[PDB]
Design a protein around this ligand. Structure first.
Ligand SMILES: NC(=O)c1ccc[n+]([C@@H]2O[C@H](COP(=O)([O-])OP(=O)(O)OC[C@H]3O[C@@H](n4cnc5c(N)ncnc54)[C@H](O)[C@@H]3O)[C@@H](O)[C@H]2O)c1
Ligand SMILES: NC(=O)c1ccc[n+]([C@@H]2O[C@H](COP(=O)([O-])OP(=O)(O)OC[C@H]3O[C@@H](n4cnc5c(N)ncnc54)[C@H](O)[C@@H]3O)[C@@H](O)[C@H]2O)c1
Lengths: 342, 344
C-alpha cells in the first residue's frame, strides 16, 4: 500500500508515502537506545503515541515541545533543544524525530545537524508544504539576529515518512499554501501534476481523495530528482517576486500565496520575453486562481518590491517543464510584466 | 618546498605544511568574490596581510576579530559572526579563513558549517594543538549552556595551511600542551615520532629546528589516516581519564597536561591487564616527563574522576606499541590499582 520515493544521494534515503505509518517508524528506530520527538504544540497526542509505541519496543523515547510556527525556529528554541538533548543523554547513535510542519522539520533538523556533530533524524511532516518541500532534501534553516534561514546546516535525514492521515486536521488555508509549491513542480518538471489538478481542482485539495496522494508522489519525485542533481535553482521558480512580497507584507501572507503571485509574474516575464507560449503562460493564472490562490497583488507595490529584491535573477520557463534563467532583465520589462499581472 | 598530506575523505582536501604560505592561500582563494578571515586578537597584523594580499587580487576581503581562547568559542561569538557574515554579504560561494588556535578553528568552523548550509573554509592553525588536531578532521565544537563541545557540526574544510613560521611566537607552555597529542599519535600509530622526540626532547620543541616539522607531518598523517576510515576511537587514547581531569579542574589544567596524565594511566591499566609490556608502559611517563608534562595527579580524586567519566566505561588501551585495543567495563578494583600506581 505505501509507495516510496528513493532520493539518490549518498547514501540514498527513502520518502515513504501512505496512511498510518507507525509500523514503518518502528521498523526504522527499534534498535536506537534513545529517541527524542520534537513536535509542534498541536501534535502532542500524536507525539505521545510514537513515544509510547517506541518505549514499548525497549527504547528510552522522550518528547519535546516547541513553539508553533515561526517561533519554534528562533535561535533560543535551538538552545532549548540542545539543553534537553543534554539532560536526556542523547548520544551519537541515537535519533531525533520531527513532527509538524516545515518549521518543526527545519528546527529539529538543525538541532540534529548540530548535536554531537550530527545525529540521525526522521522527518514526519504534517503540512503539505512540509511534505513536499521542507522535509525532503536536507537543507535546514533557523531564525537568528542575521535574518530568516541564512543560518542553517546541511544534513540529510535517515528517512521521511509522509503520512496522509495527518492531513485530515489540516485547514483549507494551509492545504492551499502548500499546493502552490505543488503547482510549481507541475510547471517546472511534471505537467501531469497540472492535468491532475485541472481535472477537478476541489478534489485536488481533499486529503481523503485519490488525487492528492498522487500529487504528493509526483511533487516529491520532482524534488528528489533535483536534490540528487546548478539546477537546484529551478525550485525557486516563482520565489524571486514571491519572497519580496512575503517581506513587504511582514510575513503575514502565507508563503504559498506569495509564491503563487510570483509564478504568475515569472510566466508573464517569460511570455513578454518571447520564451513562453501564451497558452502555457495563461495556464499559471487559471490553475492557481481555481485553487483559491492569489494571482495579483497591489499594482503600486513594484517600486518597494524592486528595493527588497536587492543584479536580479529569475527562473523562467522556456516552454512547459523547460526552465531557464533570466539575468539582470531591464527594469522597464519588470514594470511591463507587473502591469499585465496586476 | 611545502609538503602536502592528503586527507582522503569525500571531498578530499590537502593539509599543506611549510613556511610562509601566503602564496598558497592566494592560489586557493583569489577567485572568490568575498573572503572573511576570522582570527584571534594577537594575529591581527597577520590577518591584515592576508586581507591585504587578497584585496590586491580583486577579492572583497574582510577580517573579523573574535575573543581569545575559550571565550571566542561561546555561542554569543557565533551569533556575532553570523551577523557579520550577513552584513558583509558572504554567499554560498564565498569562503572563510580561520587564523589562530583550536578555538578559532572550531568557532570559525562551526560558523562556516552553519552559514547558508555550509560554505568553504580554509584553516590556518597557529598552535601545535591546532595544527595537529583541531584543524584536521571536520569536527567542530562550541561552548553552550549544554556544556563544552556537545554542540558542533561536521564539515570538511577546503584546505589546511600549516605555516611553521607562525610557531615562532608560540610560548613553551602551549607548545608542550600540543606535544601531548603528538606523543599520543606516536603510541597509537607511528613510533618514529617517539624515536624522534627521545633523540633530543628539546630539539623537538624548537620551531626553528628540523625535528618539529617532521613530528607535525607524522602526527597529521596519523590523524588523516584515521579519519579517512570505529577506528576514530584511538584518537581518544589518554582522553578518558584526561577529559575527567580537565573537567574536574574547571579547565584550569592545560588540555595537554591532562592528556599526558591520561596516557600514563591507560599505559598502567594495559600493563596490569597483561596487554602491554612493562617497557612500553614506562616509556609513556619517560617521554611525557622529559617533555615537561605532568605524569601523575591527586591520589584522592579517583571517585570524582569516575563520576565525571560516567557522565559502562570504555578505554583505549595498547596491546603493544601502535596496537590499540579496547577495555570495556574494567573491574573497579583494576582501576583503583592502576590509579594508585600512577598517583604514588
Ligand atoms: N529547509 C527547507 O528546505 C524548507 C523548504 C520550504 C519551507 N521551509 C520552511 O517551512 C516553514 C513553513 O512551513 P509550514 O508551512 O509547514 O509552516 P508551519 O510548520 O509553521 O505550519 C503551519 C501551521 O500548521 C499547523 N499544523 C501542522 N500540522 C498540522 C496538522 N496536521 N493539522 C493541523 N494543523 C497543523 C502548525 O501547528 C502551524 O501552526 C518556513 O519556516 C520555511 O522556511 C523549509
Ligand atoms: N574540533 C576538534 O577536533 C578539536 C580537537 C582538539 C581541540 N579542539 C579545541 O581546541 C581548543 C584548544 O586549542 P588551543 O590549545 O589552540 O587553544 P586556543 O585556541 O585557546 O589558543 C591558546 C592560546 O595561544 C594563543 N596563540 C595562538 N596562536 C599563537 C601564536 N602563533 N603565537 C603566540 N600565541 C598564540 C591564543 O591566542 C590563545 O591564547 C579547545 O577549545 C578544544 O576543544 C578541537
Amino acid at each position: 500500500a505505501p509507495v516510496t520515493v528513493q532520493v539518490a544521494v549518498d547514501p540514498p534515503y527513502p520518502v515513504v508515502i501512505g496512511t498510518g505509518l507507525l509500523d514503518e517508524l518502528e521498523d526504522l528506530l527499534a534498535d536506537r537506545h534513545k529517541v527524542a520527538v520534537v513536535h509542534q504544540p498541536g501534535l502532542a497526542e500524536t507525539a505521545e503515541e510514537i513515544r509510547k509505541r517506541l518505549a514499548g519496543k525497549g527504547v528510552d523515547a522522550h518528547r519535546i515541545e516547541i513553539p508553533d510556527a515561526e517561533a519554534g525556529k528562533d535561535l533560543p528554541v535551538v538552545g532549548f533543544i540542545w539543553e534537553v538533548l543534554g539532560r536526556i543523554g542523547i548520544g551519537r547513535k541515537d535519533a531525533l524525530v520531527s513532527l509538524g510542519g516545515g518549521a518543526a522539520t527545519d528546527v529539529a533538523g538543525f538541532a540534529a545537524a548540530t548535536w554531537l556533530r550530527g545525529v540521525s533524524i526522521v522527518h514526519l511532516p504534517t503540512t503539505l508544504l512540509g511534505m513536499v518541500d521542507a522535509a525532503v532534501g536536507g537543507k535546514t534553516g533557523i531564525n537568528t539576529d542575521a535574518g530568516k534561514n541564512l543560518v542553517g546546516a546541511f544534513h540529510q535525514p535517515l528517512a521521511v515518512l509522509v503520512d496522509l492521515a495527518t492531513l485530515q486536521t489540516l485547514p483549507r488555508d494551509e492545504m492551499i499554501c502548500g499546493m502552490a509549491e505543488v503547482v510549481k513542480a507541475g510547471f517546472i518538471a511534471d505537467p501531469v501534476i497540472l492535468d491532475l489538478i485541472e481535472a477537478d481542482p476541489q478534489a485536488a485539495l481533499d486529503p481523503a481523495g485519490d488525487v492528492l496522494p498522487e500529487l504528493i508522489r509526483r511533487a516529491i519525485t520532482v524534488k528528489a530528482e533535483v536534490v540528487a542533481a546548478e539546477l537546484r535553482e529551478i525550485l525557486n521558480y516563482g520565489h524571486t517576486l514571491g519572497h519580496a512580497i512575503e517581506r513587504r507584507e511582514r510575513y503575514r501572507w502565507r508563503h504559498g500565496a506569495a509564491v503563487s503571485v510570483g509564478l504568475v509574474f515569472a510566466a508573464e516575464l517569460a511570455r513578454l520575453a518571447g520564451r513562453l507560449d501564451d497558452a502555457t503562460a495563461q495556464r499559471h493564472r487559471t490553475i492557481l486562481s481555481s485553487l483559491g490562490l492569489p494571482v495579483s497583488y497591489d499594482p503600486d507595490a513594484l517600486p518597494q518590491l524592486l528595493e527588497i529584491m536587492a543584479v536580479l535573477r529569475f527562473v523562467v520557463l522556456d516552454g512547459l517543464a523547460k526552465p531557464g534563467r533570466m539575468v539582470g532583465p531591464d527594469p522597464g520589462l519588470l514594470v511591463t510584466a507587473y502591469a499585465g499581472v496586476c
